[PDB]
XYZ file of C-alpha atoms in Angstrom:
535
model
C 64.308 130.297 -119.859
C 63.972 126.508 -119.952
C 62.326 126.127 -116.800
C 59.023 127.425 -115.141
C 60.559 126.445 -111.594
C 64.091 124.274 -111.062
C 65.896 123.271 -108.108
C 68.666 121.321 -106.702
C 66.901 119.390 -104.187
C 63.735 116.673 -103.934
C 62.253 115.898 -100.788
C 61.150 112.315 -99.460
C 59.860 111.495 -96.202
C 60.898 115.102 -95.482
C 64.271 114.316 -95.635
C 66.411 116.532 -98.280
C 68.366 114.695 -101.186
C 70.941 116.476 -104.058
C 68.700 116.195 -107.223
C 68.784 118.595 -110.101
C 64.859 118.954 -110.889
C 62.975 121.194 -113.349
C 59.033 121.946 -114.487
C 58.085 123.144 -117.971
C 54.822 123.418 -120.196
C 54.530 121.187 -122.753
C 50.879 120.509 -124.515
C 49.067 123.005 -121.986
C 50.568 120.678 -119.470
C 53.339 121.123 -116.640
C 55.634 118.548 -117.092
C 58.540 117.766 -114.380
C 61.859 116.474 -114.797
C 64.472 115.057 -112.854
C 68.241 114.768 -113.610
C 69.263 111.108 -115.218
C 71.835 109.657 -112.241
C 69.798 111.842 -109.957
C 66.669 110.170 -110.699
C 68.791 106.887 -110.927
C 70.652 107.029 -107.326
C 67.803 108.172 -105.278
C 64.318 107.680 -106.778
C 66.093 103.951 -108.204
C 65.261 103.920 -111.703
C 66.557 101.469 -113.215
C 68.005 103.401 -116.467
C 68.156 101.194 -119.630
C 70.809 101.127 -122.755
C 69.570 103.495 -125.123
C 69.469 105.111 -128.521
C 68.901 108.705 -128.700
C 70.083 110.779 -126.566
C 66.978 112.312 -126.054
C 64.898 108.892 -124.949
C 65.510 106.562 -122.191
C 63.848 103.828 -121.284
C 63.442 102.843 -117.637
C 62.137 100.071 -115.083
C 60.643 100.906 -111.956
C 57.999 98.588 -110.721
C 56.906 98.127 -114.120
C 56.185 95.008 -116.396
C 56.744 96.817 -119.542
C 59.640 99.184 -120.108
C 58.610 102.631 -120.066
C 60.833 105.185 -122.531
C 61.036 108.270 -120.810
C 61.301 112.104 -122.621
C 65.150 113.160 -121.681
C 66.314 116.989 -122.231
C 69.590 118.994 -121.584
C 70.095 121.732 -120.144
C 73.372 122.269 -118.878
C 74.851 120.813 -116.946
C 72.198 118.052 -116.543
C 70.002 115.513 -118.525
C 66.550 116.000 -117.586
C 64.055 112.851 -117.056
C 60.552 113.549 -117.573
C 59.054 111.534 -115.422
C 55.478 113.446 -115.191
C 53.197 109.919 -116.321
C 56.103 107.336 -114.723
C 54.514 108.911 -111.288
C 51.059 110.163 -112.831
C 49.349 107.769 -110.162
C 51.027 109.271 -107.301
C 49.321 112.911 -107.767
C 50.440 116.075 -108.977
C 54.003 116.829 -108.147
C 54.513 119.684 -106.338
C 57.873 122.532 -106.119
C 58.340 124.418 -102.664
C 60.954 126.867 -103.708
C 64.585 124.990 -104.242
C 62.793 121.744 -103.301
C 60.678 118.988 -105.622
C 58.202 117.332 -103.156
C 57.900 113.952 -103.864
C 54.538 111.772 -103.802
C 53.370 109.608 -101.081
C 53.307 105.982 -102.712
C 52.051 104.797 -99.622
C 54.463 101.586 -99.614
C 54.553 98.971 -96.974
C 56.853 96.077 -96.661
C 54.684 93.028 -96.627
C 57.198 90.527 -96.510
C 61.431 89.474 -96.134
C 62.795 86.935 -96.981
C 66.527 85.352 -98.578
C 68.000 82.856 -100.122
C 71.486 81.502 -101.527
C 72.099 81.673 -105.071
C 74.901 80.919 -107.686
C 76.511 83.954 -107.226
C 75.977 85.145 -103.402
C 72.794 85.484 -101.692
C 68.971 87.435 -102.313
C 66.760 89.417 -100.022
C 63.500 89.987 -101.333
C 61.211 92.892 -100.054
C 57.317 92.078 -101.243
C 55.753 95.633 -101.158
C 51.979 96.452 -101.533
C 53.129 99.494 -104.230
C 56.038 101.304 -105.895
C 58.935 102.535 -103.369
C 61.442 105.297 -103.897
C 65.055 103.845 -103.071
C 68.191 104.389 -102.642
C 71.500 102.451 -101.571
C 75.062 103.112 -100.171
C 78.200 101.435 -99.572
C 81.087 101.849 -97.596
C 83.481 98.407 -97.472
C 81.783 96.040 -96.529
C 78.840 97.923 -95.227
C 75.713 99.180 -97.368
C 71.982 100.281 -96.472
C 69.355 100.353 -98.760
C 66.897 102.895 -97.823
C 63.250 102.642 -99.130
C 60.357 104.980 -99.071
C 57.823 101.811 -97.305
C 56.743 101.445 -93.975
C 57.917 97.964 -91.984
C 77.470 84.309 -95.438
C 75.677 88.145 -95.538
C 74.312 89.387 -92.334
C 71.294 92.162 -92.437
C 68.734 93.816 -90.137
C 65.993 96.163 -90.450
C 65.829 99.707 -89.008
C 62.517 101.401 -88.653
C 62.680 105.025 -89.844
C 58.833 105.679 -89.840
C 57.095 106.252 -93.142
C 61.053 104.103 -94.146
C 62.850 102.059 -93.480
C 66.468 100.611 -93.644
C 67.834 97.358 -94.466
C 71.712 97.075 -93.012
C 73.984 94.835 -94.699
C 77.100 93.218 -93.147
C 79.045 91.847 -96.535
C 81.993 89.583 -97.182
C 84.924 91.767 -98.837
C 84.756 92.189 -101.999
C 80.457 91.194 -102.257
C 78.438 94.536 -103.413
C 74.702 94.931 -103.640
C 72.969 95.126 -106.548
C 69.140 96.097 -106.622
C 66.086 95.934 -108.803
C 62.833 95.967 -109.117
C 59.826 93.169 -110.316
C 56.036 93.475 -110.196
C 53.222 91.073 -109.666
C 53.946 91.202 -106.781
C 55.884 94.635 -106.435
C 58.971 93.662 -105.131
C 62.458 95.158 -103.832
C 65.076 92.599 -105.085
C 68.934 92.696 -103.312
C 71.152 91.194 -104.382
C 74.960 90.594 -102.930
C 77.673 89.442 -105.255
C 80.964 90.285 -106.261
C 80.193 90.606 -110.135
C 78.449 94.065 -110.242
C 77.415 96.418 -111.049
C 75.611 95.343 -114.477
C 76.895 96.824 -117.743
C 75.284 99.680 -118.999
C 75.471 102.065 -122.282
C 73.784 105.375 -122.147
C 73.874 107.956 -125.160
C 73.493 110.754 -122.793
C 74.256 114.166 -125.002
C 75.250 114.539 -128.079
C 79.423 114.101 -127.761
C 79.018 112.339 -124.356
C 78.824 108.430 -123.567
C 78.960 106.712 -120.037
C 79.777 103.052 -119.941
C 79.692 100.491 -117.347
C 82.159 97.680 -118.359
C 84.202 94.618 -117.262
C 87.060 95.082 -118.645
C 89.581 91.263 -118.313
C 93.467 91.148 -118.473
C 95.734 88.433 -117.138
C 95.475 89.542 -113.871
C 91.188 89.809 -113.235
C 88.453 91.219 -114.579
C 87.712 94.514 -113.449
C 84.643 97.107 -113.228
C 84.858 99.947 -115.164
C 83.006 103.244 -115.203
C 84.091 105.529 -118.555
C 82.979 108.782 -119.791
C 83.721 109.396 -123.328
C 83.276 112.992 -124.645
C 83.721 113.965 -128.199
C 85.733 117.284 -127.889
C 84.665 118.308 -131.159
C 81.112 118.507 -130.589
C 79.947 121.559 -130.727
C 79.936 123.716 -127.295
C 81.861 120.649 -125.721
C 84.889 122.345 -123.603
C 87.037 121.195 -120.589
C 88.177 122.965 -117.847
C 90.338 122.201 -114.665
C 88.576 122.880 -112.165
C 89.980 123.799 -108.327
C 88.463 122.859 -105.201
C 88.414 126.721 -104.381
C 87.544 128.262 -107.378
C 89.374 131.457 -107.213
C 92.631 130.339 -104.996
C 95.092 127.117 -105.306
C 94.661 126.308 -101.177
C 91.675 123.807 -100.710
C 89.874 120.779 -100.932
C 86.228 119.456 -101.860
C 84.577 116.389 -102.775
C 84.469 115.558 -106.934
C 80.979 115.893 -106.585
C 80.660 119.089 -104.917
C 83.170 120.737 -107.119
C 81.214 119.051 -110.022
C 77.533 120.847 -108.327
C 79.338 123.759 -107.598
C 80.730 124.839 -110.577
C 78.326 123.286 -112.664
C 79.790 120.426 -114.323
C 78.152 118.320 -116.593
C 80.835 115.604 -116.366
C 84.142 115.780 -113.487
C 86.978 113.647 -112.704
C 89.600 113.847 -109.220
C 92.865 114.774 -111.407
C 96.193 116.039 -109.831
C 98.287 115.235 -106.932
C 97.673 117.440 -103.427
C 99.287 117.413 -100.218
C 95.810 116.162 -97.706
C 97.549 117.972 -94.964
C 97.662 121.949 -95.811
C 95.331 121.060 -98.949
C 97.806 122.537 -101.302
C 98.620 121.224 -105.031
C 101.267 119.025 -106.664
C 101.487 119.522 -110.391
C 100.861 121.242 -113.284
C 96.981 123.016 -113.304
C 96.623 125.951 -116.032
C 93.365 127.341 -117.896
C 92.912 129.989 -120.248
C 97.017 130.272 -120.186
C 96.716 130.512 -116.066
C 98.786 128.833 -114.153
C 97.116 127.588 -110.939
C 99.996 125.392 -110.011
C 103.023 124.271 -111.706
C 104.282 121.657 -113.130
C 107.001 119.340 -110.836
C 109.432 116.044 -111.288
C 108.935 116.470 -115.179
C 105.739 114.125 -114.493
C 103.029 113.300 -117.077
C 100.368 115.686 -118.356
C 98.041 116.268 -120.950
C 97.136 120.138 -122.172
C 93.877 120.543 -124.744
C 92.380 123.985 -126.082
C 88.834 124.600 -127.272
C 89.072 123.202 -130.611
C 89.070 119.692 -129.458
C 92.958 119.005 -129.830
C 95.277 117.287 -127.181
C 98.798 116.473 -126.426
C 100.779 114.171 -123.796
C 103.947 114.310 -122.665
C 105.782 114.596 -118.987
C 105.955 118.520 -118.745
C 108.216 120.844 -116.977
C 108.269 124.488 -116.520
C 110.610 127.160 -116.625
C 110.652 130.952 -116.080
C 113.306 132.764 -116.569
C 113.319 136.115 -114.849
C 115.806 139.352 -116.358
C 116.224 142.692 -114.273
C 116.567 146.023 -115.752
C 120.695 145.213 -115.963
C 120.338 142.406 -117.870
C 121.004 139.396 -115.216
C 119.000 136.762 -114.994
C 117.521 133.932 -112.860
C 115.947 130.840 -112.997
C 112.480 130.069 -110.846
C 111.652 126.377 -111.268
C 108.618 126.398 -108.920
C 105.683 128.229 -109.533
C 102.502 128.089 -107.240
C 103.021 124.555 -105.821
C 103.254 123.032 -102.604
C 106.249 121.313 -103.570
C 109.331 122.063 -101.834
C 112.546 122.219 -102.538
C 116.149 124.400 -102.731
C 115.553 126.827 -105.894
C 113.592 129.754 -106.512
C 109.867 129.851 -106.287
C 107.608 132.310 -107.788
C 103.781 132.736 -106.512
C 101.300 134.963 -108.278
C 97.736 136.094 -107.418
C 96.521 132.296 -108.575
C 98.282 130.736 -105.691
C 95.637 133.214 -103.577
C 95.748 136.371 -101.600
C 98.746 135.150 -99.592
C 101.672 133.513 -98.803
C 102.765 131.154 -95.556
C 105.925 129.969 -96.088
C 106.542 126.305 -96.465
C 110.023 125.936 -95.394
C 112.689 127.669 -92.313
C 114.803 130.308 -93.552
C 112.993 131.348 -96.822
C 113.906 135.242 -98.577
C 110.833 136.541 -100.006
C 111.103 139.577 -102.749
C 107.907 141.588 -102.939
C 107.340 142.064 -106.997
C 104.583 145.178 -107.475
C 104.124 146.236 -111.309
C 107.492 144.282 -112.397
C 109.533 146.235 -109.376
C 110.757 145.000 -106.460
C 109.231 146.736 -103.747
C 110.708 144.755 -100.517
C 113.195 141.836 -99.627
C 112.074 139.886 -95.819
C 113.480 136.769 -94.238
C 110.659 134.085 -93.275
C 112.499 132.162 -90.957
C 109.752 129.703 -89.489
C 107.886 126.730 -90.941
C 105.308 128.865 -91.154
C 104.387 131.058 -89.175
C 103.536 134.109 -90.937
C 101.819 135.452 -93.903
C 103.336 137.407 -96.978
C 100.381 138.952 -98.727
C 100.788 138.240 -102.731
C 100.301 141.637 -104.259
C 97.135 142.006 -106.751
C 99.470 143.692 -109.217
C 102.381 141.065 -108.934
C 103.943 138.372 -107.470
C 105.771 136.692 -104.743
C 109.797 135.491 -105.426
C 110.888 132.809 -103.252
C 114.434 131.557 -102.570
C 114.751 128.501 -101.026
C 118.351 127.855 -99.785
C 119.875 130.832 -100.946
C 119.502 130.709 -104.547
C 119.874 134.432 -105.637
C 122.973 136.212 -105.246
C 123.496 139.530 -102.853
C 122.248 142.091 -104.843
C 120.928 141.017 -107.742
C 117.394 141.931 -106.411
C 117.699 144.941 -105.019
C 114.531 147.267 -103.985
C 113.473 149.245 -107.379
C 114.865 146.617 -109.730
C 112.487 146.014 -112.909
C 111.655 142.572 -113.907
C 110.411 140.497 -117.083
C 109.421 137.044 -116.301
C 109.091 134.619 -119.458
C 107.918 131.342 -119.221
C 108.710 128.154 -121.395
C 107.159 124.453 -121.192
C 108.965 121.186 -122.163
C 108.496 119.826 -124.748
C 107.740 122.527 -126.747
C 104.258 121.205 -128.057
C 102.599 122.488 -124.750
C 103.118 125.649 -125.360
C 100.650 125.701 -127.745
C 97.320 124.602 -125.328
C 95.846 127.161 -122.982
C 94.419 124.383 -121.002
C 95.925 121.517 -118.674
C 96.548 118.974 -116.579
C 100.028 117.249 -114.643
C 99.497 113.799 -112.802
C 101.179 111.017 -113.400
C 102.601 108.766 -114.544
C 102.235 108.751 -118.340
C 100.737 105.109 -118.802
C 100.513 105.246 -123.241
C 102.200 107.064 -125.623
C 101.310 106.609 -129.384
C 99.756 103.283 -128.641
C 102.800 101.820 -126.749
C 103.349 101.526 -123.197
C 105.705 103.773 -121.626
C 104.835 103.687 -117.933
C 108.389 104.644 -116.108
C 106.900 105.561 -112.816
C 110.952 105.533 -111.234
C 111.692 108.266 -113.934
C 108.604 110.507 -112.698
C 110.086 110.178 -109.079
C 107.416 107.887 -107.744
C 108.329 106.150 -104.667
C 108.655 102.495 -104.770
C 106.150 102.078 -102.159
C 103.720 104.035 -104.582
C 105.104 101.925 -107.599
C 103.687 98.608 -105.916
C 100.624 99.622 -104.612
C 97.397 98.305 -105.652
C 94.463 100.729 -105.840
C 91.588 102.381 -107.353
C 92.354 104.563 -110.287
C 91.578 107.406 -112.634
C 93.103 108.116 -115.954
C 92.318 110.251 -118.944
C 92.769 109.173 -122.267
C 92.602 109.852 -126.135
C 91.145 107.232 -128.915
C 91.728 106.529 -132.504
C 89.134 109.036 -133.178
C 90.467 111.519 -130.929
C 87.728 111.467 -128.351
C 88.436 111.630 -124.748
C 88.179 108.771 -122.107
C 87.698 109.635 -118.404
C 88.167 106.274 -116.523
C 87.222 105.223 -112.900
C 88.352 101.545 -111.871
C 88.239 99.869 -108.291
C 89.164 96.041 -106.675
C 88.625 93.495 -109.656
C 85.993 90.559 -108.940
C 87.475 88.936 -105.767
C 90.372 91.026 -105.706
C 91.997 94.459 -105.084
C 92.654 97.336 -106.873
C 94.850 97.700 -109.809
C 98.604 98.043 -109.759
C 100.096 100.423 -112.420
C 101.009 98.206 -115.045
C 97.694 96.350 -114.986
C 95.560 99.841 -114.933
C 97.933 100.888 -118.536
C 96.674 97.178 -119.775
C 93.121 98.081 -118.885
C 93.315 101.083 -120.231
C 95.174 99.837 -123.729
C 92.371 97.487 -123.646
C 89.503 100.484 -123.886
C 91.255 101.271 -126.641
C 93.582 104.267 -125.177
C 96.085 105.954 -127.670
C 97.637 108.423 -125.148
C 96.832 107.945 -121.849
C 97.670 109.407 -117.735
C 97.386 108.253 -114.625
C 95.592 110.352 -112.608
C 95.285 110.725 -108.966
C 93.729 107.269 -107.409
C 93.008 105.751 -104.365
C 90.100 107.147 -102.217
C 90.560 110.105 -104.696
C 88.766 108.298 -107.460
C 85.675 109.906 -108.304
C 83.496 110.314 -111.777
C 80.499 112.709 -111.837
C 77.923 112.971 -114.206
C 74.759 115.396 -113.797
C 76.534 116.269 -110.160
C 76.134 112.603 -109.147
C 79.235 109.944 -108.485
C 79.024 107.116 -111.083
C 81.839 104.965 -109.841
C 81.403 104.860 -106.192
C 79.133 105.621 -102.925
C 79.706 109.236 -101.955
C 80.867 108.667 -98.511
C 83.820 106.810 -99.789
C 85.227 109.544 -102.395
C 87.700 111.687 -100.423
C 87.754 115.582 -100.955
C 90.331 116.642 -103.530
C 92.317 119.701 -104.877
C 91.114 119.629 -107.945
C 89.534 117.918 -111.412
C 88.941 118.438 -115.207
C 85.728 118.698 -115.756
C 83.526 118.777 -118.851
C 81.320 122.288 -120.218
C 78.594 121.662 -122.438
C 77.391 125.031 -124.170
């Protein structure tokens, strides 16, 4: 009921771009809005530090800063930007899609120049241009709605046009606007992107940051939610919603299951797109937790613990005897007994030669089968139970025979988990009660892991209890950070508790379905993410 008309999609130069839009009535008038980082990424507003959560102030081709009406309604943070393109003519909805104006742009004019920090290409323009840019390494493209050390060159695209930018490693672009004249400033340098504070709901802050230790200063993108605020709640969220087999970009799982904030979170295997660690919601286990690795488990009243979490379930017959599963819907593989349930999906392929599957249908066993091969094969999971596996012979003759009942009772470590319906396993724990504790050798990381240097993703806990969501890449002039330095960075935002999460080309923050932290193209797809409800 907050809309007249809403869609996920604007249109420019008839091409199709991801942007949450809606139109309302307000003062006998329709007014349109567009999603914050949606607006930002491909209209390029350039969106100010603000106050209120409901203003923002803006620059786009102006000379004074223009403070723009900003609404929620979940999961994104509308823009009005109805007078901002008042001269551009009535702006039209076709269905899903927001039409946008005809500014009727031309590029007048390029030219560059070296400066202090890198180099400047300057686009005059005869009016106001939509824009975009992307980078990948050490290529980027800005695209723009106008008609036409670094190395660049212009592409004609008709009513647009490109400019293509050949960097030095470690140089980014980053691009504004000026008026009198209109003008499309780029700018390549190594220090960027600029900081940035935006007040964006009430219980949710995004950062931009340097953030300096001994060994660089690094960019920063944070998300800090306030899990106390009311109708604030985090889920995990799985590339395929209803089954444990897949994987997705962040920001399509972010779109998709409608978001307001995501972050890439637990380990996968890339190659059958299966899970590695602890996932659970609403006390479901999507995957379980392996090599007693670091976690963090919340509920709905805003409270968290950390610790490095391990699972077991022990499972009794009808005599009495019982058994030990250590493994529960994971593609992690080793001798013991594995258990999969309807969360794992509607079926099993085995994972290793010479597995015994028991069939478990309302607590019985129905059915005992060798799966000899690799697989090869395909063990439905029954709706009404669950899958036993034994992985190098791990259940005596007989103890499972055909008609035995079962109880299966689970139990984390340490005991404090068992209290939160909700979590997530990663790795490894980086802060504990303000201290480092990083022991990657004891969560059975492999060296080559432990001295890799990287883009990473962490979430964290403050003094005040509110919840950090951290994105970090190569520090000015330099690479990624190695595990040690990513706990000082993250001791340095002021972390209490805080894990590692997945990193690498797995890093990925969204906020209103748009990356904050990276160009799309260079976030892989991922198993899975916690993301952030606001109700």
């Amino acid at each position: 009921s907050d809309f007249i008309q809403q869609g996920n999609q604007i249109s420019i130069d008839g091409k199709s771009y991801p942007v949450a839009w809606g139109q309302w009535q307000e003062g006998g008038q329709t007014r349109t809005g567009l999603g914050d980082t949606g607006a930002m990424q491909f209209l390029g507003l350039d969106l100010l530090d603000n106050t209120s959560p409901n203003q923002q102030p803006v620059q786009w081709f102006s000379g004074d800063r223009q403070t723009l009406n900003a609404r929620f309604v979940a999961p994104n943070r509308y823009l009005d930007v109805t007078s901002l393109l008042q001269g551009f003519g009535p702006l039209q909805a076709q269905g899903n899609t927001l039409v946008m104006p005809n500014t009727n742009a031309q590029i007048l004019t390029v030219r560059d120049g070296r400066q202090s920090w890198g180099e400047r290409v300057v686009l005059e323009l005869s009016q106001p241009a939509f824009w975009q840019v992307s980078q990948a390494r050490e290529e980027a493209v800005v695209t723009i709605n106008a008609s036409s050390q670094i190395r660049y060159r212009l592409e004609r695209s008709g009513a647009s046009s490109k400019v293509h930018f050949q960097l030095p490693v470690g140089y980014k672009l980053q691009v504004s606007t000026l008026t009198s004249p209109f003008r499309l400033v780029i700018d390549a340098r190594a220090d960027a992107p600029p900081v940035k504070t935006i007040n964006w709901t009430e219980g949710i802050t995004w950062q931009q940051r340097f953030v300096n230790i001994s060994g660089g200063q690094f960019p920063v993108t944070t998300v800090t939610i306030n899990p106390r605020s009311p109708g604030i709640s985090l889920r995990p969220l799985m590339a395929n919603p209803t089954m444990a087999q897949g994987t997705a970009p962040l920001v399509t799982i972010a779109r998709d299951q409608r978001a307001a904030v995501a972050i890439n979170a637990g380990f996968f295997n890339r190659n059958n797109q299966l899970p590695l660690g602890a996932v659970w919601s609403q006390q479901n286990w999507r995957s379980g937790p392996i090599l007693n690795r670091g976690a963090i488990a919340w509920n709905d009243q805003g409270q968290t613990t950390f610790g490095r979490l391990s699972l077991s379930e022990i499972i009794t017959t009808g005599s009495g005897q019982r058994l030990t599963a250590n493994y529960l819907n994971s593609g992690y593989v080793q001798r013991g007994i594995a258990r999969y349930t309807p969360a794992w999906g509607p079926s099993y392929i085995p994972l290793s030669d010479n597995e015994q599957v028991y069939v478990v249908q309302n607590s019985q066993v129905t059915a005992q089968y060798p799966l000899p091969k690799a697989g090869q094969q395909q063990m439905p999971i029954p709706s009404d139970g669950y899958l036993i596996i034994d992985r190098g012979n791990q259940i005596p003759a007989g103890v499972l025979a055909v008609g035995t009942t079962l109880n299966v009772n689970g139990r984390s470590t340490p005991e404090a988990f068992n209290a939160f319906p909700n979590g997530m396993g990663a790795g490894p724990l980086l802060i504990d009660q303000g201290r480092m504790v990083l022991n990657a050798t004891g969560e059975g990381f492999s060296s080559a892991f432990q001295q890799q240097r990287a883009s990473r993703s962490a979430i964290a806990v403050d003094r005040n209890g509110n919840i950090i969501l951290v994105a970090s890449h190569n520090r000015v002039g330099g690479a990624g950070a190695s595990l040690g330095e990513f706990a000082q960075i993250l001791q340095q935002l002021g972390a209490v508790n805080a894990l590692n999460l997945d990193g690498g080309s797995s890093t990925s923050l969204a906020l209103g379905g748009q990356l904050l932290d990276r160009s799309p193209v260079t976030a892989a797809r991922v198993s899975n993410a916690i993301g952030v409800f606001v109700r």
